[PDB]
Amino acid sequence: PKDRRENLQKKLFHMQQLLPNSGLPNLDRWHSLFPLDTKATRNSTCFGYPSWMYKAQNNKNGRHFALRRIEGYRLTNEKAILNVTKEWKKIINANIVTVHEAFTTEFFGDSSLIFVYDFHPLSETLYDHHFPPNNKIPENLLWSYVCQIANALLAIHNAKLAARCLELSKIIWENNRIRLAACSILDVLHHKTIEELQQEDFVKFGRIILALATNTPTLNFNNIDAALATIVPRYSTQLRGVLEWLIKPSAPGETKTVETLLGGITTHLANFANFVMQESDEKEFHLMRELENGRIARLMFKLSVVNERTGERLLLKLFRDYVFHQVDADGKARLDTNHYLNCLSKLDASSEEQILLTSRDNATVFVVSYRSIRQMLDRAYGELGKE
Amino acid sequence: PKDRRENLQKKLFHMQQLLPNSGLPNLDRWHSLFPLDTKATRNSTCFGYPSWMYKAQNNKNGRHFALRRIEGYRLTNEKAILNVTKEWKKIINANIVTVHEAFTTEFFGDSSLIFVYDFHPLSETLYDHHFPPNKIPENLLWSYVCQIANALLAIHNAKLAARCLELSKIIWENNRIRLAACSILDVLHHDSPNRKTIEELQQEDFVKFGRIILALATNTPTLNFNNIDAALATIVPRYSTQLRGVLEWLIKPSAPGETKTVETLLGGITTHLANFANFVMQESDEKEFHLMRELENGRIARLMFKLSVVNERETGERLLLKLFRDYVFHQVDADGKARLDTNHYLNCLSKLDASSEEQILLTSRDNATVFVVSYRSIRQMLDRAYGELGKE
Ligand SMILES: Nc1ncnc2c1ncn2[C@@H]1O[C@H](COP(=O)(O)OP(=O)(O)OP(O)(O)=S)[C@@H](O)[C@H]1O
Ligand SMILES: Nc1ncnc2c1ncn2[C@@H]1O[C@H](COP(=O)(O)OP(=O)(O)OP(O)(O)=S)[C@@H](O)[C@H]1O
């Protein structure tokens, strides 16, 4: 479908996107740096330092990656990078943006620390997404968020680690898929036990969901119980119950763990697993249909290698003119992308439909089907492979 | 990849796939019936009647569906088909082959009852897959447990039961399993003495659940009543203790003080549902990269469309596009023989599509002149020339 296709068109387009007038310094291992930031203002609330986001191409493999730059940071200990990235690089999770390495650079005309993450096109912060630069969220979507975050914490926690940074602005959204996008950063900048940090995780978890449910971006100390009571008419009591459990501190004799929360999740984990599957299935049928592009592109390779290098190949020449050199009555071009598309669709299927191939010298004209032409193309292409 | 390319084409070929000499009769709304039974033998153990499987194309929408034929069933009551399919038609679940309708027909030269299901290409029965005509990994077994649990959850919350729960009636396709005989016994037992309650029937599901997994785990197709506890102690060394505990919980009838529900099983599974959920998600992501690649192919094809339109329509700035085409596809070796290289073709057009800043050398027909040019420059010459033809 169209929305799915235009989403994919927007993803591929974001990756190629550049800014011809931009002046950002090329790194030793990176080039084509592109800004990901959506506003012109930066605060040090999130990191303790100003932050910049960029899309860049790797010089060695050419793939695109995301770089989070921390402004005004000087390395005072090579252990702070090495003792953190050694643990976080290993963590691979569908709801955590994977980090690869961390290094300092001086190319920004200052001292910056640079983290590399997987680049996810069209990702926008969960904050900006539910609170635009200027109603209520379905409960199902809220449960989608809880399950995804639960999946992440289970894995982080299975590594004797903690998220530390768990906020609306550091979780990326892309078609209802959310990921933790600031991992391993506070781990480095700070050099306090992991368990208490793990407990704060549950707390930060709760405020994020609570914020979305009550439609309030900024969160205060005073309404952890007030805003908790605004959700009972709009949402189920089960929802309010989970939020209450994550956010409230005590857990007096047996402290909060992810494994205990899961039974709390229950059907939504099963339901959720069902949803991702319905989605993986829908992509499967959508994939098979696109396979034609590969079949069509591969046909164009063959036709172009053969053309213009005589014989049976004359028809193939006459065929290209038929597909692409069509003109209107005044001599004006009859550009029709659909025509290009439909000829090749028919060529790929070895369609039995017939066409008229007039030579430049009009004395001879060939009546032929797409099937025959298709068989002719592979033939000529195969004879070039013999030598 | 080779496997990814080959698996998906095998799906599309199977949906369209034919057998001309079959002699099979078109129904009131269906045509082009293609047989799916892979074996030459039929027993009436599963349904009580011989069964036949077909793929058929719908007369109205042209889409393919699977039809399970029950040979020799005479309709004695319409309430049997309405009362059942109205509840099951409502259920949409990824581990359940969705059922649409049920009707009788006489086109087979007899009395047949027909169920229509969604058609899932390249599907094979869980039985034939693991027991064809060394250990099954534990990860895969939990995947089956999670999927079946997912199905039972949806079924049970609909005040229904699986009824049909066997290896031969579950289809496997790339580690994805689905129940493929649902709503049938609902019909075939719709009219019989001593009916069990949906509550009692729901309990049998759990028992059949355990036996299926147990069967895969003990790698014994045939399972007997005497080894429900015997075959159960062989898996603690091969498999984890959690797994044995769950099978025991599912299979044993007793439900000693309370009877078993899926909601209770779910909490028993715990991390394995997350593991599974995490896995399906990553696999769904990989399809996204393959998807984008194919969409990319569309962009490459659209570039060559433009390029083919311009070429042989020249000199000037279009002479370079002509020379670019020679550069990409008319490459020859030192001997003079053609140098076919799809990779060369591929990487050139990728660079053309990205408006790469990389430069390449374009030699003219006459070996005297060579153009130092970038893909970006080539790209801008290409789009500029293509736009100027729509202007006239
Ligand atoms: N792995 C990633 N892949 C792609 N885009 C990403 C990735 N991680 C982050 N982003 C993008 O980078 C941005 C990071 O968020 P920020 O720009 O720091 O939020 P912000 O609030 O606008 O800026 P502040 O206030 O200075 S933290 C998001 O808008 C995402 O779109
Ligand atoms: N809903 C379905 N969609 C696609 N293929 C299906 C479906 N249901 C069953 N099949 C295929 O049916 C084939 C065999 O059908 P079955 O009736 O389940 O087994 P069988 O051994 O051929 O027949 P009997 O009578 O049980 S011995 C399997 O290889 C499956 O791929």
Short mmCIF file of C-alpha atoms in Angstrom, two decimals, chain B residues 68 95 97 123-129 144 147-148 151 164-173 176-181 208-209 212-213 216:
data_model
loop_
_atom_site.label_atom_id
_atom_site.label_comp_id
_atom_site.label_asym_id
_atom_site.label_seq_id
_atom_site.Cartn_x
_atom_site.Cartn_y
_atom_site.Cartn_z
CA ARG B 68 -9.80 -28.57 2.82
CA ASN B 95 -0.84 -18.55 14.67
CA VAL B 97 -5.01 -20.08 9.63
CA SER B 123 3.72 -24.71 4.22
CA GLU B 124 4.47 -28.22 5.44
CA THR B 125 2.82 -30.12 8.31
CA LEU B 126 4.72 -29.95 11.61
CA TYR B 127 4.81 -33.77 11.41
CA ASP B 128 6.25 -34.21 7.92
CA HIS B 129 8.82 -31.53 8.74
CA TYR B 144 6.42 -23.45 19.22
CA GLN B 147 3.02 -19.63 19.29
CA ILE B 148 0.59 -22.35 20.33
CA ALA B 151 -3.33 -19.26 19.58
CA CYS B 164 -8.10 -30.18 16.36
CA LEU B 165 -4.58 -30.09 17.78
CA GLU B 166 -2.13 -32.45 16.08
CA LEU B 167 1.23 -32.46 14.28
CA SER B 168 -0.38 -33.24 10.94
CA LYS B 169 -2.85 -30.40 11.39
CA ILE B 170 -0.26 -27.70 12.19
CA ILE B 171 1.60 -26.20 9.27
CA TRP B 172 5.25 -25.20 9.53
CA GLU B 173 6.94 -22.60 7.35
CA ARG B 176 6.34 -20.18 12.02
CA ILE B 177 3.55 -22.52 13.01
CA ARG B 178 -0.22 -22.14 12.57
CA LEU B 179 -3.29 -24.20 13.40
CA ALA B 180 -4.77 -25.31 10.05
CA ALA B 181 -7.91 -27.30 10.93
CA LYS B 208 -2.76 -32.12 23.29
CA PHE B 209 -0.45 -29.11 23.56
CA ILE B 212 2.88 -32.31 20.50
CA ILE B 213 5.91 -30.63 22.07
CA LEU B 216 9.16 -33.30 19.03
#
